[PDB]
Design an enzyme around this catalytic site. Structure first.
Site, PDB file in Angstrom:
ATOM      1  N   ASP A   1      91.296   7.805  -6.347  1.00 31.04           N
ATOM      2  CA  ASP A   1      92.539   8.259  -4.852  1.00 31.04           C
ATOM      3  C   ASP A   1      92.336   7.857  -4.082  1.00 31.04           C
ATOM      4  O   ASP A   1      91.888   7.542  -3.699  1.00 31.04           O
ATOM      5  CB  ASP A   1      93.222   9.301  -5.940  1.00 31.04           C
ATOM      6  CG  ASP A   1      94.942   9.650  -5.667  1.00 31.04           C
ATOM      7  OD1 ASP A   1      95.204  10.073  -4.710  1.00 31.04           O
ATOM      8  OD2 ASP A   1      95.749   8.988  -6.238  1.00 31.04           O
TER       9      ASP A   1
ATOM     10  N   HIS B   1      97.944  12.617  -1.082  1.00 29.15           N
ATOM     11  CA  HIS B   1      97.625  13.053  -1.997  1.00 29.15           C
ATOM     12  C   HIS B   1      96.865  12.704  -3.152  1.00 29.15           C
ATOM     13  O   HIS B   1      97.386  13.697  -4.073  1.00 29.15           O
ATOM     14  CB  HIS B   1      98.224  11.355  -2.235  1.00 29.15           C
ATOM     15  CG  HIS B   1      99.030  10.625  -3.590  1.00 29.15           C
ATOM     16  ND1 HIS B   1      97.539   9.796  -4.773  1.00 29.15           N
ATOM     17  CD2 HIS B   1     100.016  10.076  -4.325  1.00 29.15           C
ATOM     18  CE1 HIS B   1      98.434   9.824  -5.474  1.00 29.15           C
ATOM     19  NE2 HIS B   1      99.945   9.856  -5.097  1.00 29.15           N
TER      20      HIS B   1
ATOM     21  N   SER C   1     102.655   9.703 -10.411  1.00 34.14           N
ATOM     22  CA  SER C   1     101.155  10.230 -10.642  1.00 34.14           C
ATOM     23  C   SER C   1     101.216  12.066 -10.457  1.00 34.14           C
ATOM     24  O   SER C   1     100.098  11.818 -11.120  1.00 34.14           O
ATOM     25  CB  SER C   1     101.347  10.303  -8.736  1.00 34.14           C
ATOM     26  OG  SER C   1     100.568   8.977  -8.167  1.00 34.14           O
TER      27      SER C   1
END
Lengths: 92, 479
Positions: B26, B58, B218
């Site tokens: 990520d 994120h 996600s």
């Protein structure tokens, strides 16, 4: 037999960098030699190339920064399964 | 107060990822966030294209969803992070490949227990990314990926489309598919299941004890990575097939309103929302092939995992222009092959793949004659009937087909198994006819008595689509 592939989503393509994927049981020694053969053949035709990475462990092959002009040449290298133009991925 | 999403994955009867490691590919992460500090090791592997609080947003959130102290699924679980997304959340296929390779090399150098790899990213369909994922899965690693946020068919994206990766769509607190602006969760046959993916509280990189709510496939995939971690902690020997069958089995069924999806994607999209688990039992799943395409001799093939048995085989075409399906041996292993009709747009083959150890299964076939074949041996049970034909216009342990068609019975020696057949016929020329196995029974085969578009198992319901009509379910359970 070797084929070429690039992202169908044109804005996500990254031309000028290519993943050369060799046949499944190609050994690292062979991958490294195939990369050097490409650079030699390229140089003889007046093209600079850069081998950014040699893959071993999952897929055999290498990542090369080069003009797409060289793809016909690269597809004729020994052991080549297919070549894919690099493309973008994004956080979901 | 329990976040809605953690409650949603708690099953109706309930009571930690420690011998498991979860890899995350990520953005950069804030590894000293109190949710994850001491639990997430940053590898400092980095491979990102050119462009802290925002760069780390994120990845920090997803680390928290998987393993966060307060708001995580697999609280405390061990994670290792690789950076393959830049500060704008953008990466490359080549960088992802190098990351996947890094994981395999790490494992070879210092073997540990089960590995789960979370890939909360997506690009376009990629032959090479799909191949690398398949190789890593075949090497024994569990991969979990986002379906994608494009309100599109996940089969057009990678690694969502990859063979052997668990692909996860996003549902909201009403168990409906998540809208994300004008787009939303992906769908279709490459999606394995859905999980909570809207308004998901987790670690915020804004400050070491801050929390933020985020939405996306996600976040949904991070839930399934956490569930998988806990399942593998409890049962470390699970194969990928066994893990996937449990994810399906323990999911909440039929809670998504399928009207949200495009019409043709409704049959292909699993109506499953993930949940944690609450004697041997028969687990089966439905595997849809890729569409055959319109060539006159086109076939589609649905295959099971190496440790699964194919117990039945059906087919479906939207137009109804089909020549049926057959079970045939391919590499010493039975597969489901469906045949297009000349002038048809194509067909799907639909396998029923089951975990049946110590099963001696075989196919008994009869050519056109109605045509009949039966499992004639003592101790054998019929698990599925298939039928194919060449032409362009048409008891115990017995299959019956049209006189102009070949008939195929799946017969298994499995003494610990009991099977019954349940028929339901509707006179009205109705678009759909269904018949469901009873609770505690597993549907092994679904077919129509011999203009049907086709037939398919949905969980333990046999569905027959018509442009009487009788749906026929074969239902089996452990004795």
């Amino acid at each position: 037999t070797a084929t070429f592939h690039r992202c169908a989503k044109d804005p996500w393509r990254l031309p000028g960098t290519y993943v050369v994927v060799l046949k499944e049981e190609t050994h690292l020694s062979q991958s490294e030699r195939t990369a050097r053969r490409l650079q030699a053949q390229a140089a003889r035709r007046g093209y600079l190339t850069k081998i950014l990475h040699v893959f071993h462990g999952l897929l055999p092959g290498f990542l090369v920064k080069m003009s797409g002009d060289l793809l016909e040449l690269a597809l004729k290298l020994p052991h080549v399964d297919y070549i894919e133009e690099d493309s973008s991925v994004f956080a979901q | 107060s329990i976040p809605w999403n953690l409650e949603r994955i708690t099953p109706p009867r309930y009571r930690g990822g420690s011998l498991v490691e979860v890899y995350l590919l990520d953005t950069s992460i804030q590894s000293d966030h109190r949710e994850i500090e001491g639990r997430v090791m940053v590898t400092d592997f980095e491979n990102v294209p050119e462009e802290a609080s925002k760069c780390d947003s994120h990845g920090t959130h997803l680390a928290g969803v998987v393993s966060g102290r307060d708001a995580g699924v697999a609280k405390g679980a061990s994670m290792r992070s690789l950076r393959v997304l830049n500060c704008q959340g953008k990466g490359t296929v080549s960088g992802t490949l190098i990351g996947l390779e890094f994981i395999r090399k790490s494992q070879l150098v210092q073997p540990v227990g089960p590995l789960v790899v979370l890939l909360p990213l997506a690009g376009g369909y990629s032959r090479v990314l799909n191949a690398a994922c398949q190789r890593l899965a075949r090497a024994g690693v569990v991969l979990v990926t986002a379906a994608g946020n494009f309100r599109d068919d996940a089969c057009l994206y990678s690694p969502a489309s990859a063979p052997e990766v668990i692909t996860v769509g996003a549902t909201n607190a009403q168990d409906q598919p998540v809208t994300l602006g004008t787009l939303g969760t992906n769908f279709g046959r490459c999606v394995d299941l859905f999980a909570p993916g809207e308004d998901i509280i987790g670690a915020s990189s804004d400050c070491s004890t801050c929390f933020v709510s985020q939405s996306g496939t996600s976040q949904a995939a991070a839930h399934v990575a956490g569930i998988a971690a806990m399942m593998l902690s409890a049962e470390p020997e699970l194969t990928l097939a066994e893990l996937r069958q449990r994810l399906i089995h323990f999911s909440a069924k039929d809670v998504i309103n399928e009207a949200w999806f495009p019409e043709d994607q409704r049959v292909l999209t699993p109506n499953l929302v993930a949940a944690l688990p609450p004697g041997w039992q028969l687990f089966c799943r439905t595997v849809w092939s890729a569409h055959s395409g319109p060539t006159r001799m086109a076939t589609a093939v649905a295959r099971c995992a190496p440790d699964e048995e194919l117990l039945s085989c059906s087919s479906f075409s939207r137009s109804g222009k089909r020549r049926g399906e057959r079970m045939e041996a391919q590499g010493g292993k039975l597969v489901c092959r469906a045949h297009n009709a000349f002038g048809g747009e194509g067909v799907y083959a639909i396998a029923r793949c089951c975990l049946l150890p110590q099963a001696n299964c075989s196919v008994h076939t009869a050519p056109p004659a109605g045509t009949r074949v039966h499992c004639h041996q003592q101790g054998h049970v019929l698990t599925g009937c298939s039928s194919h034909w060449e032409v362009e216009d048409l008891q115990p342990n017995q299959c019956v087909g049209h006189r102009e068609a070949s008939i195929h019975a799946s017969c298994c020696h499995a003494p610990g198994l009991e099977c019954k057949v349940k028929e339901h016929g509707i006179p009205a020329p109705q678009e759909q006819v269904t018949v469901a196995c009873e609770e505690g029974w597993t549907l092994t085969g679904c077919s129509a008595l011999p203009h049907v578009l086709g037939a398919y198992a949905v969980d333990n319901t046999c569905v027959v689509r018509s442009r009487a009509v009788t749906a026929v379910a074969i239902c089996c359970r452990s004795r």
